[PDB]
Amino acid sequence: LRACGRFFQKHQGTCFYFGELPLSLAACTKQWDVVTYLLENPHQPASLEATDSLGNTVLHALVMIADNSPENSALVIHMYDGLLQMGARLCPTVQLEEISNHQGLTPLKLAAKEGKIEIFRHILQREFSGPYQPLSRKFTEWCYGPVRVSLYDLSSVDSWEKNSVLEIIAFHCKSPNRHRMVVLEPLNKLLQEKWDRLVSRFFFNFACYLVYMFIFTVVAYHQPSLFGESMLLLGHILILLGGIYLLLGQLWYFWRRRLFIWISFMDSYFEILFLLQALLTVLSQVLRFMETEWYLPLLVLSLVLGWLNLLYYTRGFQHTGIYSVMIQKVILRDLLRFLLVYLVFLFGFAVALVSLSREARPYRSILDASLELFKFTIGMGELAFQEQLRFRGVVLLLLLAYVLLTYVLLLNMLIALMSETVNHVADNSWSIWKLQKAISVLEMENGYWWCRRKKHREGRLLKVGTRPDERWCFRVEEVNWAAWEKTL
Amino acid sequence: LLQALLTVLSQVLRFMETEWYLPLLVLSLVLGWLNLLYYTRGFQHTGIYSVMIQKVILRDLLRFLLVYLVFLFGFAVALVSLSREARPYRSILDASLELFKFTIGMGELAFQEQLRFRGVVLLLLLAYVLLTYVLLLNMLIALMSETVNHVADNSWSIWKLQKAI
Amino acid sequence: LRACGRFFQKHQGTCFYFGELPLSLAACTKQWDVVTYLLENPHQPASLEATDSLGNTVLHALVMIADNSPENSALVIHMYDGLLQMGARLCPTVQ
Numbered sequence: 091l092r093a094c095g096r097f098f099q100k101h102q103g104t105c106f107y108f109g110e111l112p113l114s115l116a117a118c119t120k121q122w123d124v125v126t127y128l129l130e131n132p133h134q135p136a137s138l139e140a141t142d143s144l145g146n147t148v149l150h151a152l153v154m155i156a157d158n159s160p161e162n163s164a165l166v167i168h169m170y171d172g173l174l175q176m177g178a179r180l181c182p183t184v185q186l187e188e189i190s191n192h193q194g195l196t197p198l199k200l201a202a203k204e205g206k207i208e209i210f211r212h213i214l215q216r217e218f219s220g221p222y223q224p225l226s227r228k229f230t231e232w233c234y235g236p237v238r239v240s241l242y243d244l245s246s247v248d249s250w251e252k253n254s255v256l257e258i259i260a261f262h263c264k265s266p267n268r269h270r271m272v273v274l275e276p277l278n279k280l281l282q283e284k285w286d287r288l289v290s291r292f293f294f295n296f297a298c299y300l301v302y303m304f305i306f307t308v309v310a311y312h313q314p315s316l317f318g319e320s321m322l323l324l325g326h327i328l329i330l331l332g333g334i335y336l337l338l339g340q341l342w343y344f345w346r347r348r349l350f351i352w353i354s355f356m357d358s359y360f361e362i363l364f365l366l367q368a369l370l371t372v373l374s375q376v377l378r379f380m381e382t383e384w385y386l387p388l389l390v391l392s393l394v395l396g397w398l399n400l401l402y403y404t405r406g407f408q409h410t411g412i413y414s415v416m417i418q419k420v421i422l423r424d425l426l427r428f429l430l431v432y433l434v435f436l437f438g439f440a441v442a443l444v445s446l447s448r449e450a451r452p453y454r455s456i457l458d459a460s461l462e463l464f465k466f467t468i469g470m471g472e473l474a475f476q477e478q479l480r481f482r483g484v485v486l487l488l489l490l491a492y493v494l495l496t497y498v499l500l501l502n503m504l505i506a507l508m509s510e511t512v513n514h515v516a517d518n519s520w521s522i523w524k525l526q527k528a529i530s531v532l533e534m535e536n537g538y539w540w541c542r543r544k545k546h547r548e549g550r551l552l553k554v555g556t557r558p559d560e561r562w563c564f565r566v567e568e569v570n571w572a573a574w575e576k577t578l
Numbered sequence: 579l580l581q582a583l584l585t586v587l588s589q590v591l592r593f594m595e596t597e598w599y600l601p602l603l604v605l606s607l608v609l610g611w612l613n614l615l616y617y618t619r620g621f622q623h624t625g626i627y628s629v630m631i632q633k634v635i636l637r638d639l640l641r642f643l644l645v646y647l648v649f650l651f652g653f654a655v656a657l658v659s660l661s662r663e664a665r666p667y668r669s670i671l672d673a674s675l676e677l678f679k680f681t682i683g684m685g686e687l688a689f690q691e692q693l694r695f696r697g698v699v700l701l702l703l704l705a706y707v708l709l710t711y712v713l714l715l716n717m718l719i720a721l722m723s724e725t726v727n728h729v730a731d732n733s734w735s736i737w738k739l740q741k742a743i
Numbered sequence: 744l745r746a747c748g749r750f751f752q753k754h755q756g757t758c759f760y761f762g763e764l765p766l767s768l769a770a771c772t773k774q775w776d777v778v779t780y781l782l783e784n785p786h787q788p789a790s791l792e793a794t795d796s797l798g799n800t801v802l803h804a805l806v807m808i809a810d811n812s813p814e815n816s817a818l819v820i821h822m823y824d825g826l827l828q829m830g831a832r833l834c835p836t837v838q
């Protein structure tokens with residue numbers, strides 16, 4: 091029986107999702123004796139293959155109910171393992187972790203999409219001995235001193251498969267946890283192996299974009315008044331073709347990412363800025379063929395965006411690529427809040443200084459007063475007792491009021507930013523850079539919109555046991571003195 | 579070694595009578611006085627402060643400089659291209675210098691009356707100012723987050739190593 | 744016998760340096776009973792003067808394997824001292 095009404099569905103209100111079935115309730119409430127009874131009573135045994143209204147099996151239900159705390163996750167890991175070990179008795183021919191819900195997700199793929207690092211790490215690295223060895227995803231090949239060599243099973247994991255765990259973490263997962271998931275084994279060595287095969291394609295793509303931005307600059311400089319002339323025309327055609335090429339390449343990106351489009355740009359803001367630079371490059375050449383002089387401010391905007399977009403490629407090296415992650419932060423969220431306070435001050439004082447500076451015994455218009463009042467924040471204030479104005483003492487008191495209120499506001503704003511951002515949290519920039527390299531790899535593996543690359547398959551087909559049990563395994567070698575010495 | 583090479587080179591260029599001896603003599607005069615800060619290690623108070631002050635800032639400013647120079651050059655080629663049409667910014671050097679003056683507080687931010695695209699030139703300056711001051715705010719907060727950690731001050735011992743060397 | 748192939752050398756990849764000798768392995772794996780047996784069995788006593796391919800003795804091997812953590816360093820200090828104290832029995836003229 092499925093408890094399927096809105097109280098039992100997963101949503102932001104008052105609810106309790108446990109799956110929908112008696113067996114999934116008994117698992118999520120941590121009742122082995124009830125789970126054992128429901129599974130192996132003679133009257134009506136609970137099928138481990140049974141699914142709720144979302145298609146979730148009890149293993150998807152346990153992944154939905156995992157929280158990344160040590161008390162929940164350790165007990166969900168035990169509940170998951172004993173149900174999987176009971177599946178090997180009760181359903182011996184059935185691969186319970188190959189059962190897909192209505193989103194096409196297995197329990198491992200669902201743990202990646204929902205960002206559940208603790209149960210994800212456990213499933214991904216799972217190892218057993220004796221009867222349950224085929225339920226492993228990790229097989230130790232040999233161990234010697236501080237060194238372990240392990241084969242990891244890549245079945246749902248390698249990006250050779252469509253809708254794989256790597257594609258999910260990069261493009262379908264919403265969570266803060268994505269950068270912690272790409273730095274787990276085997277994913278860390280597997281993404282390094284892919285990156286090493288593609289780093290020459292990454293820097294070729296950068297060198298083409300440097301040559302395009304050199305030509306863009308040499309043609310935006312050397313514009314005529316509004317052999318050198320035919321080379322200028324060639325430069326405009328190369329910019330049109332580079333602008334159409336980038337416009338088609340980014341429309342293909344957003345077409346492929348359509349179902350999860352916000353997830354595919356929330357951190358990856360350059361995928362919008364390359365589309366915008368390409369649109370403005372095509373629009374500026376179109377306005378130039380129309381001969382309208384508004385082509386030049388579009389060409390110059392797409393030249394600025396063109397060089398700002400060159401900062402995308404700083405992720406290719408650890409030192410620049412981690413710093414591009416250290417620098418950009420929570421400041422973008424709070425400056426957009428401070429800007430509302432700063433613009434009510436700036437406009438409120440601008441309409442006032444304009445109204446009062448109108449009478450004779452700067453400040454000529456709302457734009458000019460907004461600009462003179464804005465110059466106080468760049469240190470160019472021009473603060474003076476204006477001799478010709480009738481109300482010159484009140485105009486000076488309005489400037490002294492604006493200065494004091496604005497510098498109190500900037501002092502409040504800097505101290506508010508320090509209070510949230512200088513917290514001592516250990517720096518998570520290396521792992522956010524590893525996720526930027528993962529997103530870059532998983533895009534490069536498709537080739538280009540015009541030349542769609544045939545994907546190479548990672549690891550080797552190896553016999554790990556008797557199901558024989560032959561799997562695409564990937565060999566990781568770990569050296570760990572600090573963990574090993576504690577076992578001596 | 580550099581101050582000594584430039585001192586020998588500047589006297590060699592002076593014996594050659596080439597007027598480029600003077601900018602080498604003046605560079606080796608600057609380095610000459612900067613090198614006088616070596617001897618601050620002879621006393622505990624100046625010698626520990628020479629160790630408090632120099633730090634991880636030299637590593638991260640060389641990373642920020644790549645971001646700042648892509649902004650500065652990207653906006654300089656743009657303001658030069660757009661300020662070319664009549665109804666500052668005469669060359670890549672002059673626009674790089676006018677845009678650099680915004681970081682020393684000497685910005686000269688204005689609605690230029692004679693330029694055809696003067697509103698777009700002002701919007702390009704307001705875009706550069708806002709992006710650069712967001713970048714400097716990100717850079718200062720990034721530096722505080724690594725360098726204000728509460729680690730107990732290891733300057734007395736780094737000064738003892740300077741005295742050992 | 745010297746375990747001297749690249750897995751046993753010290754480098755930035757996958758490796759396990761212990762010196763290269765049975766006695767240096769027994770010391771770095773913290774096995775006094777094996778260290779005592781290798782040093783003072785009657786069949787073939789391990790020379791405390793014996794060296795790997797870098798010329799490292801067991802005392803250089805223990806210095807290579809020290810980490811500045813309190814658990815590693817305290818146990819390396821005990822392993823180093825007992826080998827040095829055994830050198831005063833087994834190699835009494837040798838510094």
Ligand SMILES: CCCCCCCCCC(=O)OC[C@H](COP(=O)([O-])OCCN)OC(=O)CCCCCCCCC
Nearest residue numbers: 294295296297298299300301302332335336361364540
């Ligand atoms: C259609 C058939 C003809 C194909 C011609 C060759 C295409 C090469 C494509 C390539 O190198 O693109 C690099 C860059 C986009 O970078 P990105 O997709 O990695 O990252 C995008 C951001 N996510 O895009 C560019 O630099 C623009 C390409 C045009 C300029 C080529 C200059 C060549 C100089 C040697």
Ligand SMILES: CCCN(CCC)S(=O)(=O)c1ccc(C(=O)O)cc1
Nearest residue numbers: 230231232233234235237746750751
């Ligand atoms: C490829 C050689 C591997 N070796 C260690 C490297 C020197 S090994 O000593 O042969 C060995 C060690 C341990 C195990 C095991 O734990 O199953 C098996 C083999």
